[PDB]
Amino acid sequence: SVGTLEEIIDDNHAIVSTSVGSEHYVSILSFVDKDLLEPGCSVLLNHKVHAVIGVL
Amino acid sequence: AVQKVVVHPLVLLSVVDHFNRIGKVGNQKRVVGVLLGSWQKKVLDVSNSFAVPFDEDDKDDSVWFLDHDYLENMYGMFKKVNARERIVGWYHTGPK
Amino acid sequence: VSVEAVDPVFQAKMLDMLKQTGRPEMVVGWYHSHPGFGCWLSGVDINTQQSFEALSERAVAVVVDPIQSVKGKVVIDAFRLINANMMVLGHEPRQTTSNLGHLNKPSIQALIHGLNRHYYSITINYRKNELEQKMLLNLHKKSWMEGLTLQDYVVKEMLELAK
Amino acid sequence: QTLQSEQPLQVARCTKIINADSEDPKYIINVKQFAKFVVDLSDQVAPTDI
Amino acid sequence: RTRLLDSEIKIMKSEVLRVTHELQAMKDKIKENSEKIKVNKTLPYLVSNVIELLDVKCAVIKTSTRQTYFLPVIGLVDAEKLKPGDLVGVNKDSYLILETLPTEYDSRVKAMEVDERPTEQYSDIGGLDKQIQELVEAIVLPMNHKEKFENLGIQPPKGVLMYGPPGTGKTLLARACAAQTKATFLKLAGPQLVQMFIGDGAKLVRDAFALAKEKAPSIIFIDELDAIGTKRFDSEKAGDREVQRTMLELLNQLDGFQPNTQVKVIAATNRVDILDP
Amino acid sequence: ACFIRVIGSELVQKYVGEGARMVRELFEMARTKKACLIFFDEIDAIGGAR
Amino acid sequence: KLLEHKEIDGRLKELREQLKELTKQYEKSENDLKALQSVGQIVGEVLKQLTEEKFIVKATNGPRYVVGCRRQLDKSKLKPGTRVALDMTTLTIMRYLPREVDPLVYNMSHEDPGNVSYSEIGGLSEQIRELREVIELPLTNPELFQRVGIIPPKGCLLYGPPGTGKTLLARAVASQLDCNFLKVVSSSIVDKYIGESARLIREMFNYARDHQPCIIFMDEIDAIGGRRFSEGTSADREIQRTLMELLNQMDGFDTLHRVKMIMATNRPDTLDPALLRPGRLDRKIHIDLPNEQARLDILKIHAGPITKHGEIDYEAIVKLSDGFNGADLRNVCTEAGMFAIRADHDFVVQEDFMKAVRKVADSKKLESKLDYKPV
Amino acid sequence: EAVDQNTAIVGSTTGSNYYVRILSTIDRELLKPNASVALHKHSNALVDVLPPEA
């Protein structure tokens, strides 16, 4: 799935937003870098723990 | 006082299994068990029931035994887990 | 819904008042429901699976959805979690695997077959009770063939309805 | 392997608080969108700064 | 002395009846407490709004998911407790009323409340003597001497306005009388009321009046009323409407039908003739 | 210090009362971190008169 | 030595009151424990009856459904448009239900407070009598208006300068007929949503249709009225649709009956001519500022329960009073009491009235343009 | 819409829109553009075309 960022917290997980507006503390698959992530970007999310999958 | 009944076959199978419970032991006469019920109108309904042990000698047909403590205990059980039900009678397997 | 739904004072009371009912027979597993979805294994089930296989030998689950049909569906579903400690050896040997292949017939429930990680369904036949089958048939048929079999043996407006 | 250890992590949906209650937490929360709920904290909180 | 010993053994029979009371009280009570353990420990409670109360002792719930439910069985409350439009703590699973909530407010209204208590004693104010007279004689005497006016026999007044040059100090009287008096004091800014959506100012002003009214010694402070006070206009092709909607909310929930007695108003503008009469 | 840039044309939005929310979140960024700078620039668009 | 009866009765009465109260607690918890297991139902409305067994219902929360009755639901009751109950799981129909109330109506139905009747207001005896003649007579005796054979007027418009007591006249009616005053403040209607206000208008008109003697009252119309736009702000679209809700269903095709609409405004020049025509609002009823005898009347109405002495030249106070309000002379009496508590006189001296009159003179040197005649 | 035989697209009154299949019980002329149609709960497939109502 695909979501959108709001803020970035250093503890391997950050806050995202869904399409309709649900928001979760979900972690990053760390082979694609988090320095790619900026507030105001479109990301890749999971369904099972909704974890941040990668860079879109 | 009773218009008619609406009796499901499940309680009949609940008679059948206790009939199986007594066909393997010394069977003197028959089965006497509890009949629960769901009495709403003057019509009647039964969803479930359970049994109670019973023996009867035949000298003055007055020696016959239930366990009202056990009866009210398992009634309290099935009344707690289902507040719809209540006792409505009994049953016996010998057709006469 | 938890393993703590097994109240041990209720266990003592229930099972002993079944002991003084017809027989003190032995528990063979456990049951539950999932009326909200298509009947697959919740997290509570694997949380209590080790408790039940500490209580029982097989400790077979029972999975059901109560909104399905009126005469047809066989909604019940049963399992056996095989341990992760036997990850070295092969998974589900099943010495013959021919009646297990004759269980394997639909490859049912694609999310449980996603959950084929240490799970498999089991054979459940609906066996005969000679003490009960013919008399259930008696109940069924001879109570539905006119009830008393003497009653209707409507008729004058279905003329117009049928025409 | 950290990620397979983070499947035992938690989803942690974020919310907003209307108000507390007296002598007991009994927290009243709308998520942002869904509804409003009476919830209770997990015991791992700072029971003051909520 | 035979009847005395008969009553002495009857005292033991009444102690056996007290033991029967102890049994049928403690046992039944703890069993029903165990059922209330099963039903009431389900701590996530969906809250909602009571639409109506039918009697065929039947309550209809509109969830905060904007959806509805009928139920014929009320639950663990009393029918006196339930007025139309109540927050009721309802279980997700059972859909049964379990609590009764106390507050229906915005947290923004909660942020308007004054707890900080600054310090401006009247010796910090110089040369504003008649204005301090007017303000104290208009507010503190309907606050401490209601019996004075009520033996005179009119009413307390309605509203005190501040206007004039922008540098005279209007914030100072607010800060000073909030510093000295100890009523439930409440502030309000002008543009904080008008919101992006249509109709939120009505909600905000109405909930503000409610929250101030439930803490009856209530002094409402208003800042830059001329932000929302406007001589309205009939025209075409253009017009900003919702400002007058929030202003008419303020006025009608302020004065007219459904009067109130416990509100005290302090407003401050920098200009004058922008306002409606 | 925590220097903050503010264009005077930032308050030029589409929706009513949004600049109020802008002033809100400006000063709420100002209050948390202490000893900060906020720079306004071209305050004509913020408004000349009444 | 026969006090054992008192001791036995003491222990037995203690145990008996304890058993009564404790079994009463256990019985309350018994009934509240019996009532635990029940499950709520779904609120829906009947679109139409499909067949003898099939029923087309649409609940408010979403989609449409087709189910049937249980056994004894008495299908002739189900007129198309009744509000019924549905199971959560099985989703069939359970019980026909009475109609909704929408307690936004209730917060402007029950919340009429007490008031004094129409003798309290005064100096405007034209409008009092005239509103009585146009409202109370075609609802008490319609045959006076049927023997003539002329349709009664429906809507009445109060207008004029601010502070002429346009509110309190309707409030006096709300202390005269006391029947079904649905006093809508007409500013707390719109909240944020799409068609919620239209549904509230439908609800009010249904409720007024049913409880046959209803009085519709919508104060401060101009917020929700407007006139029209060249399509500027987007919320004004739903404003105009919310107004066209009223524009249709006040007239429609199904004509209202006994639905008397009392209207008040601050400036009637800004209304829509869609609302300004007769038929909806029949007779424009104008209130203006009191004259000399009228100022005398309001002044002596307010000067009744005021502790003073027999010195009051009312002609002096009304003489300095020039073009004032319902509340102006109320403010005169209020500030007269204020100046009485100034210097602690414990009666109201007559010079306090002149001081309050000059305070009113200080007040109304900041207000003007008090003449908004519509159309 | 109708893709072909035994496959169509319907938009249910949940607002969403579904790739579904049709039954051979439905006479294929009653699709014309737009009919009130009947569906299933679990599988959510077309069951029946309704007479003009709604």
Ligand SMILES: Nc1ncnc2c1ncn2[C@@H]1O[C@H](COP(=O)(O)OP(=O)(O)OP(O)(O)=S)[C@@H](O)[C@H]1O
């Ligand atoms: N009478 C006074 N005595 C002492 N200090 C005063 C007096 N009047 C004004 N001041 C001072 O001047 C300032 C005036 O306060 P302000 O904050 O400007 O109030 P205000 O903003 O003028 O009210 P507005 O702008 O007309 S709404 C205060 O900070 C005081 O220190």
Ligand SMILES: Nc1ncnc2c1ncn2[C@@H]1O[C@H](COP(=O)(O)OP(=O)(O)OP(O)(O)=S)[C@@H](O)[C@H]1O
């Ligand atoms: N002629 C009058 N006689 C007696 N009391 C009056 C009179 N005029 C006004 N009042 C009082 O003053 C109040 C003024 O009511 P208003 O709120 O001004 O009516 P209104 O229609 O709201 O006027 P506006 O345009 O909103 S200011 C009334 O509630 C009465 O208490």
Ligand SMILES: [Zn+2]
């Ligand atoms: Zn489960």
